[model samples]
Target chain A: DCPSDWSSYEGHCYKPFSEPKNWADAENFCTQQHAGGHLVSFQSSEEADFVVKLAFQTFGHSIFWMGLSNVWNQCNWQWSNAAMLRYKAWAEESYCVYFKSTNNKWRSRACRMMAQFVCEFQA
Target chain B: DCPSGWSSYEGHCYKPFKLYKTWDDAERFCTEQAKGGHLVSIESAGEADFVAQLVTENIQNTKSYVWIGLRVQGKEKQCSSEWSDGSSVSYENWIEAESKTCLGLEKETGFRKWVNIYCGQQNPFVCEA
Candidate 1:
């Protein structure tokens, strides 16, 4: 259901890019990877936890960006693919969100911050 | 290809069982599973990583540990050790513990290193061929 280089869980395929990139650049990279590809957005806690484990296994104690940001407005958050923000793991904030491996929840950071990011596409 | 339930890495085939048993019993189980199979002997860092990843993929939870193939020989303060497959000790990933007879791979997240445990302890195990 996924490319050899991509990790699959359920019906989605994911690729973790270890290279550091800004939030917008990472989202753009994911958009260009496949037709419906986008920076990863978890729809449920199960999916969110799976992503955390996958990131931990692949990156090892490194923080990485997700497809989440609130650059549009300080009050509203959104996924890069415009998917509904149905689940959240926010532990603590700029505009962009990244997951810290030492902790379980997501944290907000500056959109210009450089960090590894993960991409996801439905199978 | 390796057996249906077994995973292939390099030239080896590996399979992990969730069933708990003593280290000696697990070694016997691996021998009975396939003609050339034995408790997995991790000979290199890459092989150890692959085995750890395989175990993480199959087994859930961070609390469980799995038996590998290293054990003390004559029990002289844990001095002469060997893999159940009789492979030379070319590599090691010990968790830096003081003393124990057998090796158990800790499955906890961010801590996949092998830890020393008693041989009589029951734990899950991986087999290789």
Candidate 2:
């Protein structure tokens, strides 16, 4: 049910942040698992606030990669699952890259650089 | 002043997170540069919730290391700088060989068997008490 040795939260199998992989690779890994689902969307403002707080706690700063990007388009950022965009909190003019830094907020980043990542699923 | 191109955030120097090293090495790096500070502690549950949210955004999962004030003394943890203790370890156990041996000397023992070491050298380490 919970998959092998995976810790379950809200009926979802969660993996550790140390599980490093590139953007596309990570997406494929999550897909192969066929657990709850790949990271779909982060729409709640309350959720955003909570994520920032966690960033400060985990890495001692607020910078990390998110599921939102414009890999298909140049600057048209969208969720990996192709969900419709609703609420977004961009600094000024942000673009898409493979990797991003939690310290730089949501600046566009490259794809090859390895860093911490998060996955999500429905309860 | 900016310490050697170290980015400043709120009057504090912040290095990139990509600088991979052991927890101890990370601490030493931060210390030598007199940068802002090592990851002290995660005091707010709101912050905890935020980290969880970020985890979902990045990897589609909710599990990662956090800089809470607790370690050493057989789980009787405290901040590296002797800061006050106000938090407890989360209900979890790290996997074997998962303690961030980012800086180690590889030593081959036998066929299909190799060993890495933790020498007293500068490496990426997050310095938490």
Candidate 3:
């Protein structure tokens, strides 16, 4: 079950924060939120679609940081939670990932760029 | 906010029901579900993709079809398409069309394409308003 104020989908809990933070800070915030917590990651196009719709309904037309980044290896994009990147939807990339709802694709920017984000809690 | 069991996307609300019904019957159920409600129409590729995702989230089906609002208006061999809500036909995601009078989207993942089906065939459906 999800915690109060968090939404549940496919047995995972998600909470979007309007407060903006840099990629590293956003990851840390999600980590501090709960046990097994991490920034939002997608294992399927359905999950990606759901999260984008979730973000659109919650924040309107806006971008939110995701849990993926290539900051450590530049070439190896990986989730903060270390999940396998089997499914991907890239509009383009920099170092850290963010979801742009207008196009419904995962984009990237430098890790220091600040943006609102969603936290995920694994069930 | 959308009602409980209904999901929102863009400017509209949607809900998918697993109850089996013929195309016309499903449309009637949608009308009774809410004021101005009707079977869903895929207005664009985005709408089609969204609906495909939405249906999968609510119901698990790999070999069935879900009734959508597309239909042929005239009885001629060549046809004019129209939506159940009387919205103008703006987009189409048809897969193959050696077809039938009504349309149903496949509930499977790989080829979630629209296929024409007999209007009297029973299937699950999604509603929109």
Candidate 4:
């Protein structure tokens, strides 16, 4: 079961925030929340597509951070909680992933920047 | 007869761009290139999903994008997309699971990075009859 305030799809519940923070702080935020909270990750294109649209509908045309980052390995992209990167959508942005406002295009942003973030929890 | 470089699906003809262009430019190209041509218009969910399945599902397919006949009504009188075919644009796949949710592949990227762009950003789109 999931909270009524949060949106659930497949087997997970997703929460997007309009707050601002850097990637490191953003990572900490997800890790600390929920029982097993972490940045959101896509296991399929359908889920990726859903979350992206959800982000846009929630925040309009703006970049929001997710759980996928390669900060530890520079270009070695992986999920924040050490999940598999099998369903990768690493475009020109090679270091991190952000939901580009409007297009919902998957983009990689630098670690030092600020943006809204989305946190995911297991159901 | 459908022209070369185009694929025939159902009763219409479609061309997916390996090269990229803006929504504005793609619309312009579709309008000028064929006698009865304009940017592809999806009247129903079937047409929209059929396109998405092929492009998005192709593992080796690059250029996974196609500008179809849907427009964003941003800052305009319309809120949802307005289909070129003049049909009422009321299809949302997520809300109604079996309807057209406007799916497409991302040669470059995913609602359908087919955003309400400024119509000036470049992306490969599909042209149809």
Chain A TM-score, each candidate: 0.78, 0.50, 0.78, 0.74
- lDDT score for candidate 1 against the true structure: 0.67
Q: Which stretches of candidate 2 lie over 4 Å from their true place?
A: A1-16, A32-34, A55-63, A71-105, B1-129
Q: Report the C-alpha lDDT of model 3 over B1-129, residue by residue, as the tens digit.
A: 888989888888999998899877898899899888888866666767788888887756535678777655432221323321223334322212212446677744322566545567788889988
**A121 Cα displacement, candidate 4 (Å):** 1.5
Docking quality class, candidate 3: incorrect
**B48-95, model 4: which lDDT tens digit per residue?**
566665445432344334555554322222232322112342422221
How well is each residue in A19-64 modelled by candidate 1, as lDDT tens digits? 9998889988988888678787755556667887888888888888
Candidate 3: where are CA atoms >4 Å away? Answer: A1-123, B75-99, B109-111
DockQ for every model comes to 0.01, 0.02, 0.01, 0.03
Cα lDDT, all candidates:
0.67, 0.34, 0.67, 0.55
Name the candidate, 2 or 3, with the larger DockQ value: 2
Interface RMSD of 2: 22.2
lDDT of 1 by residue, B74-118 (tens): 433323232222223333222222224566787443225666466
DockQ, model 4, C-alpha based = 0.03
Docking class of 2: incorrect
Comparing only chain A of model 3 with the true chain A, what is the TM-score?
0.78
Compared with the true structure, what per-residue lDDT tens digits does model 4 show for residues A44-97?
A: 567767787888888877888755554223223222223344432222232345
How well does candidate 2 score on lDDT at residue B78? 12
